[PDB]
From a paper:
Multifunctional autoprocessing repeats-in-toxin (MARTX) toxins, secreted by multiple Gram-negative bacteria, are primary virulence factors that promote initial colonization, dissemination, and lethality in a wide range of hosts, including humans. By doing this, the clinical strain V. vulnificus MO6-24/O generates a MARTX toxin (MARTXVv) containing four effectors, which are arranged in the following order: domain of unknown function in the first position (DUF1), the Rho inactivation domain (RID), the α/β hydrolase domain (ABH), and a Makes caterpillars floppy-like effector (MCF) with a cysteine protease domain (CPD). Previously, we reported that DUF1 and RID within MARTXVv are not uncoupled by activated CPD in host cells; rather, they are discharged as a duet (it is assumed that the DUF1-RID effector module acts as a functional unit). The data show that DUF1 acts as a RID-dependent transforming NADase domain (RDTND) that disrupts NAD+ homeostasis by hijacking calmodulin.
To provide structural insight into the enzymatic activity and potential substrate promiscuity of RDTND, we next determined the structure of enzymatically inactive RDTNDE/Q-RIDCBD/CaM in complex with NAD+. Overall, the NAD+-bound structure is similar to the RDTND-RIDCBD/CaM structure (root mean square deviation of 0.97 Å); however, the RDTNDLid shows marked movement when bound to NAD+. In detail, the adenine group of NAD+ forms a cation-π interaction with R2234, hydrogen bonds with G2179, and hydrophobic contacts with F2001, F2150, and Y2181. In addition, the 2″-hydroxyl group in the 2R-ribose moiety interacts with. These interactions rotate the α9 helix by 42°, bringing RDTNDLid closer to the catalytic site, suggesting that RDTNDLid may play a role in recruiting substrate. The di-phosphate group of NAD+ forms hydrogen bonds with S2083, G2084, R2177, N2180, Y2181, and F2182. The 1R-ribose group forms a hydrophobic contact with W2082, and hydrogen bonds with D2107 and E2186Q. The nicotinamide group interacts with W2082, I2117, T2153, and Y2181 via hydrophobic contacts, and with D2107 through hydrogen bonding. In particular, residues W2082, D2107, and E2186Q are critically involved in maintaining the stable conformation of the nicotinamide and 1R-ribose sugar. These structural data suggested that W2082, D2107, E2186, and R2234 are critical for substrate interaction and/or catalytic activity. Unlike CD38 and Aplysia californica ADP-ribosyl cyclase, in which the catalytic site pocket has no spatial restriction with respect to cyclization of ADPR after hydrolysis of NAD+, RDTND has a smaller and narrower pocket due to the bulky residues R2234 and Y2181. In particular, Y2181 is positioned between the adenine and NAM moieties of NAD+, and therefore obstructs rotation of the adenine ring during the ADPR cyclization reaction.
Author numbering:
A (entry chain A): 1967 to 2371
B (entry chain B): 4 to 148
Amino acid sequence: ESLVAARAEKVANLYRWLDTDNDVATDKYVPVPGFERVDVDVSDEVKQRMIQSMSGYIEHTDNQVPKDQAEALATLFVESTLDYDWDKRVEFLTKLESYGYSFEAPHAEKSIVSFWSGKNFKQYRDILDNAQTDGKKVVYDIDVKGNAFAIDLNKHLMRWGGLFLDPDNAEQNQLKSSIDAATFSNTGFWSSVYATGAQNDVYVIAEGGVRLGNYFWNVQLPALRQLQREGLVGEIRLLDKPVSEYKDLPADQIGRRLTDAGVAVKVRFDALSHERQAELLADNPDGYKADTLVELDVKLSAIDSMLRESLPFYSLRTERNLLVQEGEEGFEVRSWPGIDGKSKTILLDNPEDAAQQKSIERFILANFDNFEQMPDELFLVDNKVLSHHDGRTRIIAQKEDGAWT
Amino acid sequence: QLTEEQIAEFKEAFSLFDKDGDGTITTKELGTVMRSLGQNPTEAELQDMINEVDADGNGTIDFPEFLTMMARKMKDTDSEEEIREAFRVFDKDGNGYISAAELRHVMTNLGEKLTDEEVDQMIREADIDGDGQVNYEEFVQMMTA
Ligand SMILES: NC(=O)c1ccc[n+]([C@@H]2O[C@H](COP(=O)([O-])OP(=O)(O)OC[C@H]3O[C@@H](n4cnc5c(N)ncnc54)[C@H](O)[C@@H]3O)[C@@H](O)[C@H]2O)c1
Ligand SMILES: [Ca+2]
Ligand SMILES: [Ca+2]
């Protein structure tokens, strides 16, 4: 069974899950989130040129493709790309795998699969590797050769549209845009395929803050959230501060959650609201390209505050990695995301009462660091909190405030 | 200053963290206690507050010092307009609607400890229209209430 094929299958399911509302997916087309399909209108004449130019690029360049198939791979690559053909896209990757290109992290189980946005991300590698105790090493997708080769062919086809198409023809202009879109959809796909392989804690280099509308936001973060929920990834550690701010910290205290308060928020111009576009073009009509990163005075952290208040015992997830859910007889507690078999019990006097939920919430915060520390059963009854771990104890009672023992 | 009802809420919560009833909490636990009362200081703001209280290096905060701090961060934050602006940044046209798909993307991204099911539930139970659109101000309302 092919490694990259199983990755792609997982990505397909995530993409179809993100598309659950738009319902635009077919048997053949799976949409890349944030990367709309722009249909390609090409004659077979034009296609076979693209193919041969690509056949050429492979033929005489340093790579591991058998020269027999130089032309077959080209044809597959452009067809997969230009027809947005999901099956063929996977086939391409499978074939690269069959020539000895790995889509796995180079250091195996000691790889810290990590992510970047912006140009300075390489200078974070050394501070991060030296913070590790066990010889774990940071990898970026640029370090994995399968992704690197594919991204290479992908730049070729993108550039070929710049050279062989006169933009003064209306069609061939539209065409160059198509290539670009299809080209971007590839980069997205392969980004998710990389992200899907992440394990344990991971690093995201985003100096000066989280970026909305880019590859990490569109195709990598959703995949990381999936892996957290399967218990495969732990903490997503964002680094938004200069390298110097991470000195003399262990690996566990470097970076923070991208929904923590005080994380800055940059957005591509081409992802801003009309309201904010106008504002900026008023003062500077010319200094706003598509990729121009605009800092916004917004707190992404607010969304997590909302959830804190909307969902019972959410804060116990964020704070203590505990999942507390409605149960057959009251509340069940688990190690988030509730995936190991182990289960302890919270029983409440009045389980529907908000104030009683918060009381036991805050008691758990104050008394337990994690699941393992908790008694098999925790009661709150007539304003006493009790544990039951073969013996029963009432460790606190309320009389306008909380006293202990 | 604060309301007496707020001082009360703050006391009841604090007291659970004051684990031998001397009127102090651990400095390590400040963020936690503030957050559980609906205030969300940055790591910078937390450090500031700690330094002001911990010159002597015992690493504890009085209950009056804790009220000062809650009061301070309460002035800075309007929870309502912070939640609005967050969602508004994904509203291309600014009419107060985004696509359901766009709302699924935002919530899966900006939900640290959601399950996939809870996201499904959020979108299921939202009032999506024939365009496939959702009023996020209403969405927030429903999630809050
Ligand atoms: N290895 C690569 O060459 C490569 C390329 C793209 C994306 N990625 C993956 O994604 C992340 C870096 O990309 P990013 O966008 O998050 O960071 P970024 O903001 O630094 O953008 C990096 C590149 O992506 C382009 N880009 C960003 N958003 C785009 C969009 N919506 N449409 C078209 N092009 C867009 C930018 O123009 C730039 O060329 C990394 O985590 C990496 O794994 C890798
Ligand atoms: Ca002190
Ligand atoms: Ca809108």
